[PDB]
Scaffold this active site. Structure first.
Site, PDB file in Angstrom:
ATOM      1  N   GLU A 186      49.307 -20.016  70.683  1.00  0.00           N
ATOM      2  CA  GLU A 186      49.006 -19.056  72.036  1.00  0.00           C
ATOM      3  C   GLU A 186      47.855 -18.556  71.523  1.00  0.00           C
ATOM      4  O   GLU A 186      46.672 -18.233  72.017  1.00  0.00           O
ATOM      5  CB  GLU A 186      49.907 -18.528  72.581  1.00  0.00           C
ATOM      6  CG  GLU A 186      51.104 -19.733  73.730  1.00  0.00           C
ATOM      7  CD  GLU A 186      50.251 -21.008  74.584  1.00  0.00           C
ATOM      8  OE1 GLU A 186      48.858 -20.604  74.752  1.00  0.00           O
ATOM      9  OE2 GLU A 186      50.678 -21.734  74.806  1.00  0.00           O
ATOM     10  N   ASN A 205      40.403 -20.916  81.923  1.00  0.00           N
ATOM     11  CA  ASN A 205      40.595 -22.571  82.700  1.00  0.00           C
ATOM     12  C   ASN A 205      40.200 -22.952  83.990  1.00  0.00           C
ATOM     13  O   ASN A 205      39.579 -22.227  84.556  1.00  0.00           O
ATOM     14  CB  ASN A 205      42.432 -22.452  83.362  1.00  0.00           C
ATOM     15  CG  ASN A 205      43.369 -21.768  82.171  1.00  0.00           C
ATOM     16  OD1 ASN A 205      42.975 -21.564  81.426  1.00  0.00           O
ATOM     17  ND2 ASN A 205      43.947 -21.356  83.179  1.00  0.00           N
ATOM     18  N   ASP A 220      40.182 -24.165  86.564  1.00  0.00           N
ATOM     19  CA  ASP A 220      41.024 -24.447  88.008  1.00  0.00           C
ATOM     20  C   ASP A 220      40.805 -22.539  88.243  1.00  0.00           C
ATOM     21  O   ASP A 220      40.161 -21.506  89.642  1.00  0.00           O
ATOM     22  CB  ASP A 220      41.778 -24.379  88.224  1.00  0.00           C
ATOM     23  CG  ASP A 220      43.050 -23.053  87.696  1.00  0.00           C
ATOM     24  OD1 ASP A 220      42.964 -21.936  86.725  1.00  0.00           O
ATOM     25  OD2 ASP A 220      44.055 -23.348  87.874  1.00  0.00           O
ATOM     26  N   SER A 246      41.304 -19.932  86.962  1.00  0.00           N
ATOM     27  CA  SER A 246      43.012 -19.058  86.644  1.00  0.00           C
ATOM     28  C   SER A 246      42.621 -18.192  85.275  1.00  0.00           C
ATOM     29  O   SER A 246      41.678 -18.670  84.656  1.00  0.00           O
ATOM     30  CB  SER A 246      44.158 -19.363  87.276  1.00  0.00           C
ATOM     31  OG  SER A 246      43.963 -20.768  85.799  1.00  0.00           O
ATOM     32  N   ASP A 278      44.458 -17.042  81.017  1.00  0.00           N
ATOM     33  CA  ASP A 278      45.554 -16.603  80.893  1.00  0.00           C
ATOM     34  C   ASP A 278      45.481 -15.349  79.561  1.00  0.00           C
ATOM     35  O   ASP A 278      44.448 -15.357  78.820  1.00  0.00           O
ATOM     36  CB  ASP A 278      46.378 -18.070  79.642  1.00  0.00           C
ATOM     37  CG  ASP A 278      46.046 -19.337  80.514  1.00  0.00           C
ATOM     38  OD1 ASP A 278      46.577 -19.023  81.111  1.00  0.00           O
ATOM     39  OD2 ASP A 278      45.320 -19.708  79.151  1.00  0.00           O
ATOM     40  N   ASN A 300      49.682 -17.441  82.566  1.00  0.00           N
ATOM     41  CA  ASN A 300      48.533 -17.816  83.436  1.00  0.00           C
ATOM     42  C   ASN A 300      48.627 -16.342  84.863  1.00  0.00           C
ATOM     43  O   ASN A 300      49.738 -16.212  84.900  1.00  0.00           O
ATOM     44  CB  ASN A 300      48.968 -19.045  84.091  1.00  0.00           C
ATOM     45  CG  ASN A 300      47.423 -19.241  84.661  1.00  0.00           C
ATOM     46  OD1 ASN A 300      46.402 -19.597  83.768  1.00  0.00           O
ATOM     47  ND2 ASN A 300      47.556 -19.846  85.442  1.00  0.00           N
TER      48      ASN A 300
END
Ligand SMILES: [Cl-]
Ligand SMILES: [Cl-]
Ligand SMILES: [Cl-]
Ligand SMILES: [Cl-]
Ligand SMILES: [Cl-]
Ligand SMILES: [Cl-]
Ligand SMILES: [Cl-]
Ligand code: NA
Length: 129
Positions: A35, A46, A48, A50, A52, A59
């Site tokens: 990650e 992201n 969308d 959002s 992380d 998220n």
């Protein structure tokens, strides 16, 4: 902060992740490697809108407030910036809520694709724990 592999295994063990909801420590160190490369300051945007955050790439759509993810929830009740700290407590505590959410560690796409069904014990091999 960029953790060492054994340094992170020890910090996660001290914070109660070893066998948390049945996931042995190697699973969590494997997820953190793929990650974030063990970097608490990792962020990734992201499609969308959002973001992380931190060593476990938690998220903003569901778990933390960053003030720029419209219609999102804050299920861990923290600012997303708390997930970037050298102190992994906020990330671990939020990870415990996520992994309890019904899908276990499948919530972490890099765990499902790179750690699941591999020899995850290799990630803690040689560490004084
Ligand atoms: Cl490594
Ligand atoms: Cl393990
Ligand atoms: Cl928001
Ligand atoms: Cl919320
Ligand atoms: Cl906040
Ligand atoms: Cl820590
Ligand atoms: Cl599970
Ligand atoms: Na949010």
């Amino acid at each position: 902060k960029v953790f060492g592999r054994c340094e992170l295994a020890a910090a996660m063990k001290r914070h109660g992740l070893d066998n948390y909801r049945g996931y042995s420590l190697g699973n969590w160190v494997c997820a953190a490697k793929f990650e974030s490369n063990f970097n608490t300051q990792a962020t990734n945007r992201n499609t969308d809108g959002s973001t992380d955050y931190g060593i476990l790439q938690i998220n903003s759509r569901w778990w933390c407030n960053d003030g720029r993810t419209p219609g999102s929830r804050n299920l861990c009740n923290i600012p997303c910036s708390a997930l970037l700290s050298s102190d992994i407590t906020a990330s671990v505590n939020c990870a415990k809520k996520i992994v309890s959410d019904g899908n276990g560690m499948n919530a972490w796409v890099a765990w499902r694709n790179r750690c699941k069904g591999t020899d995850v014990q290799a990630w803690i091999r040689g560490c004084r724990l």
